[PDB]
């Protein structure tokens, strides 16, 4: 009791986070896009209603909290998050940071300037809303660009000043986590404040256990993503991969079997609208996974239980790990 | 009489546009940036007050209308435009289109989809404001990227459907106007609906008269830009160039002397905030040109008169040409 996390509806006790999905999105978009072209998603109203239905379904499956890791450049709309959070009765933690699509007004900034931006969103509020970010999202896609080095350093500095955790996008197959870890540590950030995400996009357990041994959280956060059965759809193939959800889920068991149960975070990287990729990618995704953000509790957790993972361990991963991670420290 | 142009304060008669600067900005930024980080500009209030002072000064010098060619990806804020337009009593024509910093949500779009977006902003309104664009801004920086080819085609289609003109950013030294012209003509767009901009960034009159002979408007729109005296400032050097304003202004006379007075549009490409480049570039610019958007009427027009250009010709360039260009056709 006593520790607090900021959500889009205000502060909540850490102990009320409960079953938490730590890498999710209401909408994958771009800054200003939902405002300028809402008809892309049918309408803003259609998008919100779809998100409320999806979050209610996740709620019914036992999900109490999601962390929406949409940054500024993912077109995070904190009013949308608040509306759908309220309607579905699911907590949503908003993010600051920058993903891999920053515009020039961000790309021209120094580490100091980026630190001030991230601190604004954490300490003051996002835009004019007073809604505070509870996490900092960063990204590389292979070796960090010079700008990305600054973003990661600014993320570490903002984390150190606020206790708010950092979570990352990687190209898992390129083992980005190792360089991200080196940059974060160069700023004196504790590995326990860091989740190396999209880590289930690889089966390289040497890479994954290397990180977990150093105290990093390992985000196995793309559980439902697979283009098996869709190999003729080139865009779906490129984004989803050819590994099954069971193959992804097996990595959760693999880490637990190797002593790293306390270092795992599990999620879907799901969304209810998606404008930053090919048109109608949302229809493809909805066909593959109509369960949306209930997929983890309905499919993954029972798979693991049937493979012999004890319920206390499963509770530790889905409840205790996100609580420790999100609790500002 | 009778013909109308849309401004941020609503429709105005074409004949009331008067002395018009056809390539200008209130603020050079990025989508969502002013909303998320207004302190970058001191505050939104500081930015608006600065813009009102600048536009009042341009007004006192005889400027009646500016065309703000800020697109979505330049972080156009149509409420800001309306506020400052109203306070300074200067008409402002807003833009649709895309510049050279589109986010992924735009970059993944087809020509058809981009056409619908541009048509929304022209025919329905920008965001939820009902403010309609009166011009379509596009950009290349050398040879068009595949995406830029789509943007230019979508611009032509939107122009053909609405009569609204198209205006371009070029890398003038690379003669981008020739390819832009070829793409526009491939869509059956009339050259009289097109301004090839930043054309005063080059002294290649073979290139410029080539375009003017085909019926294109030639935008000599960076009049005050020079890093002469600043050669030690690398960023200012790269963006401003080493040619004097008088050298730029001489191109207006050169085109008039070659029979092309009706094909010239003159502007500054000025702004009152600038986040898409190096920090404090606005301070450098304000030192070079404290006259801001009054520079053309105070310095350029008298220079031309003293070089023998008749007042009727100068009136034709600054009043009749923008009227014909902006009048939907
Ligand atoms: Co990602
Ligand atoms: Co994501
Ligand atoms: Co330009
Ligand atoms: Co411009």
Torsion angle in degrees (nearest 10) through CA of A200, A205, A208, A214: 160
A30 three-state secondary structure: coil
Phi, psi of B74 (to 5 degrees): -90, 5
Tell me the C-alpha distance between B282 and B274, whole Å.
6
> Is B91 annotated as ligand-binding?
no
Long-range contacts of B180-186 (CB under 8 A, 24+ apart): B180/B138, B180/B140, B180/B144, B180/B152, B181/B211, B181/B214, B181/B216, B183/B144, B183/B149, B183/B152, B183/B153, B183/B156, B184/B152, B184/B155, B184/B156, B186/B153
Alpha-carbon torsion (A167, A169, A171, A174), positive or negative: negative
Structure tokens of A157?
A: 């500095």
Asked if A105 and B39 come within 8 Å (Cβ–Cβ), the reply is: no
Measure CB to CB from residue B108 to each of A103, A113, A277 and give the nearest one.
A277
The dihedral through the CA atoms of A247, A250, A252, A254 has a sign that is: negative
How many residues does the structure list for chain B? 329
Q: Is any Cβ of chain A less than 8 angstroms from the Cβ of B260?
A: no
Three-state helix/strand/coil letters over B167-184: EEECCHHHCHHHHHHHHH
CA distance A45 to A216: 39
How close is the nearest chain B Cα to the Cα of A27, in Å? 12
Closest residue in B to A281 (Cα–Cα): B108
Could you tell me the distance, in angstroms and rounded to a whole number, from the CA of residue A139 to the centre of ligand 2? 10
Q: How far is A102 from chain B (nearest CA, A)?
A: 8
For ligand 1, the distance from its centroid to the CA atom of residue A21, given in whole angstroms, is 14
* A124 at B interface, C-beta within 8 A: no
Among residues A117, A40, A29, the alpha carbon closest in space to that of A74 is found at A29
Q: What is the DSSP letter of A121?
A: I
3-state per-residue secondary structure call for chain B: CCCEEEECCEEEEHHHCCCEEEEECCEECCCCHHHHCHHHHCCHHHHHHHHHHHHHHHHHCCCCEEEECCCHHHCCCHHHHHHHHHHHCCEEECEEECCCCCCHHHHCCCHHHHHHHHHHHHHHCECCCCECCCEEEEECCCCCCHHHHHHHHHHHHHHHHHCCCEEEECCHHHCHHHHHHHHHHHCCCCHHHEEECCHHHCCCHHHHHHHHHCCCEEEECCCCCCCCCCCCCHHHHHHHCCCCHHHHHHHHHHHHHCCCHHHEEECCCCCCEECCCCCCHHHHHHHHCCCHHHHHHHHHHHHHHHCCCCHHHHHHHHHHHHHHHHCCC
Strand pairing category for B10-13 and A264-266: unpaired
DSSP secondary structure letter of residue A298 = I
Resolution in A: 1.9
Question: Which domains, from first to last, does chain B contain?
Answer: 1-329 (3.20.20.140)
Alpha carbon B305 to its chain's center? 24
Interface test mutation site (partner A, options B36, B132, B276, max chain A beta carbons within 10 A): B36
Q: How far apart are the first and last CA of chain A?
A: 15
Give the separation between CA A110 and CA A150, rounded to whole angstroms: 7
A314: helix, strand or coil:
helix
Residue with the two structure tokens 């000043």:
A161
Residues flanking ion ligand 3, Cβ below 5 Å? B 169
**Residue burial A218-245, b: 16+ Cβ < 10 Å; e: rest:** bbbbbbbbbbeebeeeebbeebbbebeb
Q: How far are the Cα atoms of A28, A77, A293, A300 from residue A286, in angstroms, in the given order?
A: 14, 22, 11, 17
- First-last CA distance in chain B: 15
Total Cβ atoms within 10 A of residue B324? 16
Distance CA B183, CA B189 (A): 9
B273 to chain A, closest Cα gap in Å:
11
**Distance from the Cα of residue B15 to its chain's centroid:** 20
Neighbours of A139 (CB within 10 A): 27
Contact between B142 and B172 under an 8 Å Cβ cutoff? The reply is no
For residues B75 and A36, what is the distance between their CA atoms, to the nearest angstrom? 11
CB atoms within 10 A of CB A124: 11
Give how far Cα B248 sits from Cα of A15, A297, B253, B302, Å.
67, 67, 10, 14
What's the CA-to-centroid distance between A175 and ligand 2, angstroms? 17
Query: Which backbone phi and psi does B249 adopt, to 5 degrees?
Result: -60, -35
Question: For A96, which residue in chain B has the nearest alpha carbon?
Answer: B36
Partner-chain residue, chosen from B33, B103, B275, that has the shortest CB–CB distance to A30: B103
Question: Token pair for residue B9?
Answer: 């304060």
The pair of three-digit structure tokens given for residue B233, joined into one six-digit string: 């400032």
Of A72, A121, A128, the CB nearest to B32: A72
Residue whose structure tokens are 């977006």: B117
**DSSP 3-state of A111:** helix
Cα distances from B55 to residues A325, B26, B47, B282, in angstroms, run: 51, 9, 12, 16
Pick from A130, A196, A122, A127: nearest CA to A161: A122
Phi, psi for residue B313 in degrees, rounded to 5: -75, -45
Q: In the β-sheet with A166-169, what is the strand arrangement from edge to edge?
A: A95-97, A135-139, A166-169, A194-196, A217-220, A264-266
Angle between helices B44-60 and B78-88 (to 10 degrees): 50
Method of determination used here: X-ray
- What does the angle CA B315 – CA B198 – CA B59 come to, to the nearest 5 degrees? 40
**For residue B275, which of A71, A75, A125, A102 has the smallest C-alpha distance?**
A102
Question: Distance between CA A291 and CA A302 in Å, rounded?
Answer: 15
Of B66, B76, B127, the C-alpha closest to B98 is: B76
User: What angle, rounded to 10 degrees, do the helices at A205-213 and A245-257 form?
Assistant: 40
CB contact under 8 A, A108 and B73: no
DSSP three-state, residue A170:
coil
Q: Which of B167, B192, B205, B156 is nearest to B321 (CA)?
A: B192
Tell whether residue B268 is among the known ligand binding residues: no
Beta-bridge mates of residue A28: A274
Q: Is A234 on the interface with B (CB under 8 A)?
A: no
């Amino acid at each position: 009791t006593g520790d607090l996390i900021n959500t889009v509806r205000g502060p909540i006790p850490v102990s009320e986070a409960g079953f938490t999905l730590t890498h999710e999105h209401i909408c994958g978009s771009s800054a200003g896009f939902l405002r300028a072209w809402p008809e892309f998603f049918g309408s803003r109203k259609a998008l919100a209603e779809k998100a409320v239905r999806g979050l209610r379904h996740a709620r019914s499956a036992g999900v109490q909290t999601i962390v929406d890791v949409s940054t500024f450049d993912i077109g995070r709309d904190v009013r949308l998050l608040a509306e759908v959070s309220r309607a579905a009765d699911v907590h949503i933690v908003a993010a600051t940071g920058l993903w891999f699509d920053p515009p020039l007004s961000m790309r021209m900034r120094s580490v100091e300037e980026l630190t001030q931006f991230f601190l604004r969103e954490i300490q003051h509020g996002i835009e004019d809303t007073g809604i505070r970010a509870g996490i900092i999202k960063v990204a590389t896609t292979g070796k960090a660009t010079p700008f990305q080095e600054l973003v990661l350093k600014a993320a570490a500095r903002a984390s150190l000043a606020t206790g708010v955790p950092v979570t990352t996008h990687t190209s898992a197959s390129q083992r980005d986590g190792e360089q991200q870890a080196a940059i974060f540590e160069s700023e004196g950030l504790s590995p326990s404040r860091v989740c190396i995400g999209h880590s289930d996009d690889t089966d390289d357990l040497s890479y994954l256990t290397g990180l977990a041994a150093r105290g990093y959280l390992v985000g196995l956060d793309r559980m439902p993503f697979s283009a098996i059965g869709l190999e003729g759809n080139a865009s779906a193939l490129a984004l989803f991969g050819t590994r099954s959800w069971q193959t992804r889920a097996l990595l959760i068991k693999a880490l637990i079997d190797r002593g790293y149960k306390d270092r795992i975070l599990v999620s879907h990287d799901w969304l209810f609208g998606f404008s930053s990729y090919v048109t109608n990618i949302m229809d493809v995704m909805d066909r593959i996974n109509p369960d949306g953000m209930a997929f983890v509790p309905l499919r993954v957790i029972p798979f693991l239980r049937e493979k012999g993972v004890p319920p206390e361990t499963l509770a530790g991963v889905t409840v205790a790990n996100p609580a420790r991670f999100l609790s500002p420290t």
